[PDB]
Design a binder for these strands. Structure first.
Lengths: 1326, 453
DNA sequence: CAATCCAGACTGAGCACGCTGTGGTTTGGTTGCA
RNA sequence: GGCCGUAGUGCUUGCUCUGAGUUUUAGAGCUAGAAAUAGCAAGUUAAAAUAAGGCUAGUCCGUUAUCAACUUGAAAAAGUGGCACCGAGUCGGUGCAUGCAACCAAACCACAGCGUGCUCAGUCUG
DNA sequence: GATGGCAGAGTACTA
DNA sequence: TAGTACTCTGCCATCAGAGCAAGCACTACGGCCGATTG
């Protein structure tokens, strides 16, 4: 047995580890090897790293599940429509639906006529000539009044139902309101008629252009207000206009209503809101509100319709037909123009599907943007194409009916068209008249988001409860699904449990019991002092009850003056009163009690005890439910208790928020001795006046015992469940689980003796989003910088360009305009200096013409600059270009700047880890490692867990020449773990007073101490520290510069580090989601069981779960002889279950005969094989391999590469370049090492020759450039999948090992989580 | 001529013995006891042939009879210290732990020779052959003892139980003692003058004159003849002044030491290993009663005896070895203690080692009875010289009690520490009771003593 | 009035380690005689 | 530093929805040519599928997490591998692993006395 | 984004 | 010579939205909270 410490470093896809002794020396022991090879033992250093693929979130799985559910529901809608139509469809055409179902079928496979609608070619051609598109048929059905074919009626209705539209706008829409200016004039006329005191005229104002502008709604409101005299914003007219355009205006200022009176036109509660508002204010404003509603409908419709509706009842269909006609006319004109002006490109434009143009636009896969990009130069270099270019610029040239911009069509337009069709056609078909309501319900029914899936107990995502067991259809959804209980379950299944009482659910935040509990908790910890009192008293239960009943239940917020006057002076009759322990105004107050008092108007009911259940139910309903309908249906049982008006007010009132304490903990549990609850104890507990924490921590009472019994009940879950319940990124959670497993394995390895200390560290850790953010900011601010020079997302990916665009093209510190073309010449300066903290985000980075404009570089920008540009920064913040945090950091100078305490805190938090995830990791490790208690049931800290930040190790490496290069190999993870262990152990040995802030368990003076915390390693600081360091007050040596640095250097230069790639069975998608066209190949996968790939297309590139080594016999040649074969078979994800069910049958089906179950070997990804000369390969797939060896470059070469390459960019720097110049001849040795390693392992002859030729040709370049490019050459000799790299201009492609034949006679190695335990299986024997 | 007169008493003519007075004895067992069967342990071919003649003769006498029993113990031969007779031993290891325990009444060798008075100068030592086989064993307890013996020549294979008391049994020495004592108890009454000493089987007859011994020997032979016990005639010293008994020479009423025993101690060369030194110590220790101040003489060799140590035979160790070799060359003649007369003990203590001599009156001179020497305990080692003598007397007085048979004795020492015990300047209270008991000990006139004594 | 900045000693209890004395089990050795 | 309150950002989980995209089929191509071929015309839409599929038959579920080898188990799970030193090109080598009595020594348990350090309560001081 | 699948062109060995 | 059969090289990967609810983690802002010294 020997004392040792375990050092760890945790990453998203790597967990290094290292075991050290008391002298900072990595041990080494012989490990037995199992299997069947001749080798029986192996020596390994106790240092290594584990590599694995990064974890993934469930966002993609959730999206896929939602898509599946949506497709299923769409098919169900189609089935409902067919069931409605079937009885009459049988008479009209019996096999119509059958023909529709088999449209996706070749002529031979079809059991009916290939024509799906009428069944004969004459009628098919006639119908397609009469109605070129479905919109023609829809408009004809809407407009015409004669009898129509039932098949055509069903086709139009089915198209409308299948493609409904967005449900963003609630309520109802009437498409008859189309014009904008005329409706605005009509609204102005109503305004003048009603409010005749002051005239309102909008003559000579381009209302249509102002309102239909693409700018923001607020910008449009401001423009309309400015271009209208006699009124301003927040007026009655301004509020009406804001409500019409979409903004939510407060109508209190318009009528002095003293309530919120906020209306949103799109919301479903607008009806009730307007009803109560009109009841309060009078009915004369109903005309104005209706005019505003009509104006809003016209404004929202004119964006998409763009067609008059006085001649037709199908505006969307008419617009689609107009687009079709414009496409036809433009196509004919373009055809004629090309044929006449330029006949040299007619074939490539109108016939070549490979290139863009009309052929690639229609027949090919080219998009509208690509077509426009291809046809813009051709259109410009022509004659008589001015209108065509105008249409192209307006994005209205040769538009298909079904486009990506069709996402703004509400479902109300389709509903109106369907209603018109049904109304027209209901005369001839009685069943259409009888089923109109249910067809409309089919079109306009959606499952509420709180109901969730309509399962029957076989779903883990469902919570809906059913009041009946019949099948749920849209026509009995209300009669079957329990909406209120479903919504309650939806909210409750996500809310948190009580931390002190896990078993019970937490109370609502605004609960009356919670408010009483908080008020009493704050009240019991106060002490009053009056004349003639020797010692302060605690305001015992009677006084507390009097104070509660006379102060909190009468005023919203309680103050000390009111406490002294209304109670102490009035009742206690003590003029001199000295309260203590509380501020001027109490924090907690009965907020909910006062809200109900002004509504129910019953003090006796509010004070009575037997209705506390009713009050809790009311507040629970208000917190749980968001929709007015469910609130009302839940409060129906209480209709008897309160009159209709009070009921309506209660429905209107809504609370948000949930508490952290359970009702059982607050009031249910009672003390065993006297049967008193926590609330009763707070109300009166002798004269001690204990609070909640004292009550639950008191040993005499049984509260602690009851809490411990409940907490123990259920028992801690598994480690996997604990890590899953932890909050953080899935990659970090996977790293934590792997770290725990490697810690357990190391403890088992080292003689089952726990380490003295454990040191851990964890690393800290879009163009389209940036584009949408800048678009929103530009629209809000009204600027035209984007219009001046459009910028693509790839261009916006540049940091400097992004900063310039966010700053609106202006300097952040002076009132000047910067030039986009003159970029790459200014400097980017962080708001907070880089010395204080490490943060390179956009939230802290600011681009300015000159970094000197801020003034001092050691603090927040100058007060003069802050005062100069505070207005501009406020405008940018209101434009959402900058964040609230960025604004607060920028304007810190006015608040006072960075104080010395702030500087000290900034420098302290750099060396100390404060992350909740790291705290959780430390807690888990401590709980697992230490499990022995003491005589007083106190845990003994057998193992100490220390958390450090990466700054200490990075500074150690930089200061003492332990430079790290990440491109050499993967040994840097193990080196980081070892250095973390060494630094942590040395720190805790040197400073035992710092255990609180590191081990899990003055301002000026505090500054310099933290800055010089790592000085005891240094020799010359000119102060000369002793060579041997000591703890102080003890005879313990914590460092020895004579030999400990040499020991660290020796450890960092060991050529043996246990690097292990975690083998994983691939899971996920079956194959690539792309559907390829039909082709003669066996690689295609059928999309359905009956769909032949060679006739219908299918998927390709299946994902292999795990390879299987099978030894069997196959039939080769016409003789059908059995040739023994040993080969790797890739079991894809789709067939994994079938292979597991019957491996024998699965293998025999593929063609193998006489397989061997014993010889069957399952090989997941990253399986390691040892071939010869130490050459290792990892199984990438069934027919590919990966590199599996690491290059142990000498530390001298690593340091030279770092110093020459200038990683992370006076006298100290002067000697570095001199050292590099002296050691110029190291580049040849590095190249020789790379070449010999490649020849021994990589075996890429052509790539190595190309690399050597490039290096020889680039021998005259400077040493800095040469080393920086030599760093790239290590991609050739790396671990993992081959990758392409670059040496100066020359580029080198991948060398892929696409053969797995040689690994069938190699040695297969099974490695544990640390790699010290192995099982070498020789495959040549098989 | 002795053999002819008493054919029923000598083993060479009387044949096998059988106690005609003692009844068959049942060997009891504990309440929680079960039969145990142990296979016969492997025995070398040379040791097997040693016992084989005994089994053949034991079968004829009826001592060993074939039987079938669940009890079985492995036979084991033990060769005599002389020749290769290979006496038969049953090796009842398991039975001893299972058989009940009785209070031993065997006499310890220290106290037998104390009963011999110097007045009785004529001796007659008779040793009973096959002593333990005389007592009959009840057939109920016969299955308890058994062993496996298979010889193709004999033609009988199986267990052969014992009809008499076997050898190697833990209760055999005790059961034979009581049985023989009762039979000879009647003999003691008839002859008050004779002094009969009994040690398991060895009998010693002490008489005043030659005629008294001759008459006593005939009566003893006749008494033992009727009782069935047979005495060996090959080794039976009858009516001789020089006799050997209990390993001690008896001449002129003095407990001499055999010349052969002295040769063995000196004959061994200088020890070289702790085992070699341990062997020599025991020989010297058995003679400790003759060597004056043996505790201090062999003091240097004691710390070398420890199992954990280095055997460094230094000059001091060689000096201790030479002292013991020369002391045994001129060992004196220890006299037989006479219980009628009072005893006298000299006590001296130098350097933490107590030495002394127990003497008795012989005319005008004092004759040594036994040389007493001891090592003081470490608690008394650090005491001052005045207090060390008090502790030395208490240790030596305890040793004298085991030989004086509790008779009063006089403690003589150079100093006058006898008054110091009354008024010394837990253990001390224990020492006060031992030294102030006027019934058993007293202090005579204070006087020094010669260093040799 | 405004802003900035626990340690030691003694007493009582539980030990825990080192030394001395007694009691007891068992192992080596020593003879004796069995 | 701590608390209380709030304003914002980011991330995670779950639910309800929309627009496209892809694939097969339908939308009769014409003329001159034996045939390839050439010249014109046309192009905008619709049906079905959107992980194969499963049984639990629901307007449900099916891409997250977890997973070296061997033994014991239905399974959940539990077990399986010596140490030190000198070295270093992916780890190597060396070395170790029958009975009786009394007296003396090692070690063990229990108790009594002395010296000394750790933990808890109290007091005082700073 | 990167790594494994896949089609196609190319070269090689045997019936 | 025809037919498999293995190897190297370049192309290619479904994408965009809209709401709701709960939780955690971190970042600023306002207000507190004591005692001592200048």
């Amino acid at each position: 047995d020997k004392k040792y410490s375990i050092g760890l470093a945790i990453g998203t896809n790597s967990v290094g580890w290292a075991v050290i002794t008391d002298e900072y020396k990595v041990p080494s022991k012989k490990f037995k090897v199992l299997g069947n090879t001749d080798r029986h033992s192996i020596k390994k250093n106790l240092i290594g790293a584990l590599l694995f693929d990064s974890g993934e979130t469930a966002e993609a799985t959730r999206l896929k599940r939602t898509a599946r559910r949506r497709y299923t529901r769409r098919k169900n809608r189609i089935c409902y429509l067919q069931e409605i139509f079937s009885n009459e469809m049988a008479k009209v055409d019996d096999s119509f639906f059958h023909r529709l179902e088999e449209s996706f079928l070749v002529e031979e496979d079809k059991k009916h006529e290939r024509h799906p609608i009428f069944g004969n070619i004459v009628d098919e051609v006639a119908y397609h000539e009469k109605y070129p598109t479905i919109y023609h048929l829809r408009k004809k059905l809407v407009d015409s009044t004669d009898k129509a074919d039932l098949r055509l009626i069903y086709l139009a209705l089915a198209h409308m139902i299948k493609f409904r539209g967005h449900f963003l706008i609630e309520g109802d829409l009437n498409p008859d309101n189309s014009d904008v200016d005329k409706l605005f004039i009509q609204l102005v006329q109503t305004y003048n008629q009603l409010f005749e005191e002051n005239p309102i005229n909008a003559s000579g104002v381009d209302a249509k252009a102002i309102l239909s502008a693409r700018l923001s709604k607020s910008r449009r409101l401001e423009n309309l207000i400015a271009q209208l005299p006699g009124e301003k914003k927040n007026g009655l007219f301004g509020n009406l206009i804001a409500l019409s355009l979409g903004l939510t205006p407060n109508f209190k200022s318009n009528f002095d209503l003293a309530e919120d009176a906020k209306l949103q036109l799109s919301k479903d509660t607008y009806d009730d809101d307007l009803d109560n508002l009109l009841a309060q204010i009078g009915d004369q404003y109903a005309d104005l509100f209706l005019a505003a509603k009509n104006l809003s409908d016209a404004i929202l419709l004119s964006d998409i319709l763009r067609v008059n509706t006085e001649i037709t009842k199908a505006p969307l269909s008419a617009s689609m037909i107009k687009r079709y006609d414009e496409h036809h006319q433009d196509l004919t004109l373009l055809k004629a123009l090309v044929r006449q002006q330029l006949p040299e490109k007619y074939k490539e434009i109108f016939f070549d599907q490979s290139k863009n143009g009309y052929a690639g636009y229609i027949d090919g896969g080219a998009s509208q943007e690509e077509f426009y990009k291809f046809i813009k130069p051709i259109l410009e270099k022509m004659d008589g194409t001015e209108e065509l270019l105008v249409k192209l610029n307006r994005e209205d040239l040769l538009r298909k009916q079904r486009t990506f911009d069709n996402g703004s069509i509400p479902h109300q337009i389709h509903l109106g068209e369907l209603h018109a069709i049904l109304r027209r056609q209901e005369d001839f078909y009685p069943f259409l008249k009888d089923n109109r309501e249910k067809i409309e319900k089919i079109l306009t029914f959606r499952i509420p988001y709180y109901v969730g899936p309509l399962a029957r107990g076989n779903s883990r995502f469902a919570w809906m409860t059913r009041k009946s067991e019949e099948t749920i259809t849209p026509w009995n959804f209300e009669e079957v699904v329990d909406k209120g209980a479903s919504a309650q379950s939806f909210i409750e299944r996500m809310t948190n449990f009580d931390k002190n009482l896990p078993n019970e659910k937490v109370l609502p935040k605004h609960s009356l019991l919670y408010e009483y509990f908080t008020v009493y908790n704050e009240l019991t910890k106060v002490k009053y002092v009056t004349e003639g009192m020797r010692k302060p008293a605690f305001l015992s239960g009677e006084q507390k009850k009097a104070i509660v009943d006379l102060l909190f239940k009468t005023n919203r917020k309680v103050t000390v003056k009111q406490l002294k006057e209304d109670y102490f002076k009035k009742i206690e009759c003590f003029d001199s009163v000295e309260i203590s322990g509380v501020e001027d105004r109490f924090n907690a107050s009965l907020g909910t009690y006062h809200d109900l008092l002004k509504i129910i108007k019953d003090k006796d009911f509010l004070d009575n005890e037997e209705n506390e259940d009713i009050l809790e139910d009311i507040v629970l309903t208000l917190t749980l439910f968001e929709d007015r309908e469910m609130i009302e249906e839940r409060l129906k049982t209480y209709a008897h208790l309160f009159d209709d008006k009070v009921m309506k007010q209660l429905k209107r009132r809504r609370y948000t928020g949930w508490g952290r304490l359970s009702r059982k903990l607050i009031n249910g549990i009672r003390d065993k001795q006297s049967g008193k609850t926590i609330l009763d104890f707070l109300k009166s507990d002798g004269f001690a006046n204990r609070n909640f924490m004292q009550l639950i921590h008191d040993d005499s009472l049984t509260f602690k015992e009851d809490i411990q019994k409940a907490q123990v009940s259920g028992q801690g879950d598994s480690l996997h469940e604990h890590i899953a319940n932890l909050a953080g990124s899935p990659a970090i959670k996977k790293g934590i689980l792997q770290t725990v497993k490697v810690v357990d394995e190391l403890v088992k390895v080292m003689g089952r003796h726990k380490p003295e200390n454990i040191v851990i560290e964890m690393a800290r850790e879009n163009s389209r989003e940036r584009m949408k953010r800048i678009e929103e900011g530009i629209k809000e601010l009204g600027s035209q910088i984007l219009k001046e020079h459009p910028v693509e997302n790839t261009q916006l990916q540049n940091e400097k360009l992004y900063l310039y665009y966010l700053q609106n093209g202006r300097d952040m510190y002076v009132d000047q305009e910067l030039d986009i073309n003159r970029l790459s010449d200014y400097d980017v300066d962080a708001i907070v200096p880089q010395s204080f903290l490490k943060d390179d985000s956009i939230d802290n980075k600011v681009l300015t013409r000159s970094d000197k404009n801020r003034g001092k570089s050691d603090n927040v920008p100058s007060e003069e600059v802050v005062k100069k540009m505070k207005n501009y920064w406020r405008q940018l913040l209101n434009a959402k270009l900058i964040t609230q945090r960025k604004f607060d950091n920028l304007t810190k100078a006015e608040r006072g700047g960075l104080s010395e305490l702030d500087k000290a805190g900034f420098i302290k938090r750099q060396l100390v880890e404060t992350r909740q995830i790291t705290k959780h990791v430390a807690q888990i490790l401590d709980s697992r490692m230490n499990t022995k208690y003491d005589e007083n049931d106190k845990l003994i800290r057998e193992v100490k867990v220390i958390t450090l930040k990466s700054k200490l190790v990075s500074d150690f490496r930089k200061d003492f020449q332990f430079y790290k290069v990440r491109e050499i190999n993967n040994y840097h993870h193990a080196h980081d773990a070892y250095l973390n262990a060494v630094v942590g152990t040395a720190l805790i040995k040197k400073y035992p007073k710092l255990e609180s802030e590191f081990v899990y368990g003055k301002a000026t003076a505090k500054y310099f101490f933290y800055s010089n915390i790592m000085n005891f390693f240094k020799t010359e600081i000119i102060r000369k520290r002793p060579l041997i360091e000591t703890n102080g007050e003890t005879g313990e040596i914590v460092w020895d510069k004579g030999r400990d640095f040499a020991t660290v250097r020796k450890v960092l230069s060991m050529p043996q580090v246990n690097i292990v790639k975690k083998t994983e069975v691939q899971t996920g998608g079956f194959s690539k989601e792309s559907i390829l066209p039909k082709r003669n190949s066996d690689k295609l996968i059928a999309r359905k069981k009956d769909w032949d790939p060679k006739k219908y297309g299918g998927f390709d590139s299946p994902t292999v779960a795990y390879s299987v080594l099978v030894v069997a016999k196959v039939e080769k040649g016409k003789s059908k002889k059995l040739k023994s074969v040993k080969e790797l078979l890739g079991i894809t994800i789709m067939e994994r279950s079938s292979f597991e069910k019957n491996p024998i049958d699965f293998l025999e089906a593929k063609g193998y005969k006489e397989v061997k179950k014993d010889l069957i070997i399952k090989l997941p990804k990253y399986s390691l094989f040892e071939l010869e000369n130490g050459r290792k390969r990892m199984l990438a797939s069934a027919g590919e391999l990966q590199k599996g060896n690491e290059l142990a470059l000498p530390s001298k070469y690593v340091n030279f590469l770092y110093l020459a390459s200038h990683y992370e960019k006076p006298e100290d720097n002067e000697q570095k370049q001199l050292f590099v110049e002296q050691h110029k001849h190291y580049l040849d040795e590095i190249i020789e090492q790379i070449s010999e390693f490649s020849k021994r392992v990589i075996l890429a002859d052509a790539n190595l020759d190309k690399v050597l030729s490039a290096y020889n040709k680039h021998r005259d370049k400077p040493i800095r450039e040469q080393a920086e490019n030599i760093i790239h050459l290590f991609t050739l000799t790396n671990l993992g999948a081959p990758a392409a790299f670059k040496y100066f201009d020359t580029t080198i492609d991948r060398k892929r090992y696409t053969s797995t034949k040689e690994v069938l006679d190699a040695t297969l190695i099974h490695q544990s989580i640390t790699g010290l335990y192995e099982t070498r299986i020789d495959l040549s024997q098989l | 001529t002795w053999l002819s007169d008493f054919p029923q008493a000598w083993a060479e003519t009387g044949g096998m013995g059988l106690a005609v007075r003692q009844a068959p004895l049942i060997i009891p067992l504990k309440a929680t006891s079960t039969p145990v069967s142990i296979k016969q342990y492997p025995m070398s071919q040379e040791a097997r042939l040693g016992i084989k003649p005994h089994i053949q003769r034991l079968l004829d006498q009826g001592i060993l009879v074939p039987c079938q029993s669940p009890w079985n113990t492995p036979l084991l031969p033990v060769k005599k210290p002389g020749t290769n007779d290979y006496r038969p031993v049953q090796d009842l290891r398991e039975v001893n732990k299972r058989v009940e325990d009785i209070h031993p009444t065997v006499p310890n060798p220290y106290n037998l020779l104390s009963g011999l008075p110097p007045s009785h100068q004529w001796y007659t030592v008779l040793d009973l052959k096959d002593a333990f086989f005389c007592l009959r064993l009840h057939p109920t307890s016969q299955p308890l003892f058994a062993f496996e013996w298979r010889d193709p020549e004999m033609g009988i294979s199986g267990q052969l139980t014992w009809t008499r008391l076997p050898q190697g049994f833990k209760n055999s020495p005790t059961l034979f003692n009581e049985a023989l004592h009762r039979d000879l108890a009647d003999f003691r009454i008839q002859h008050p003058d004779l002094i009969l000493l009994q040690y398991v089987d060895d009998l010693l007859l002490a008489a005043t004159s030659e005629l008294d011994c001759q008459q006593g020997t005939r009566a003893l032979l006749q008494t033992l003849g009727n009782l069935g016990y047979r005495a060996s005639a090959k080794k039976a010293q009858i009516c001789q002044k020089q006799v050997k008994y209990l390993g001690y020479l008896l001449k002129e009423g003095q407990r001499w030491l055999t010349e052969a025993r002295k040769e063995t101690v000196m004959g061994q060369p200088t020890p070289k290993t702790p085992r070699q030194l341990r062997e020599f110590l025991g020989k010297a220790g058995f003679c400790r009663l003759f060597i004056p101040g043996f505790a201090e003489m062999a003091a240097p060799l004691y710390p070398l005896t420890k199992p954990g140590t280095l055997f460094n035979w230094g000059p001091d160790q060689q000096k201790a070895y030479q002292e013991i070799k020369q002391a045994l060359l001129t060992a004196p003649a220890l006299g037989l203690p006479d219980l009628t007369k009072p005893f006298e003990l000299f006590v001296d203590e130098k350097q933490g080692y107590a030495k002394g001599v127990l003497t008795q009156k012989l005319g005008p001179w004092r004759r040594p009875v036994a040389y007493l020497s001891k090592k003081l305990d470490p608690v008394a080692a650090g005491w001052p010289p005045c207090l060390r003598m008090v502790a030395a007397i208490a240790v030596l007085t305890k040793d004298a009690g085991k030989l004086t048979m509790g008779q009063p004795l006089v403690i003589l020492a150079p100093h006058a520490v006898e008054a110091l015990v009354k008024q010394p300047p837990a253990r001390m209270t224990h020492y006060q009771a031992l030294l102030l008991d006027t019934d058993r000990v007293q202090f005579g006139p204070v006087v020094a003593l010669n260093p040799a004594t």
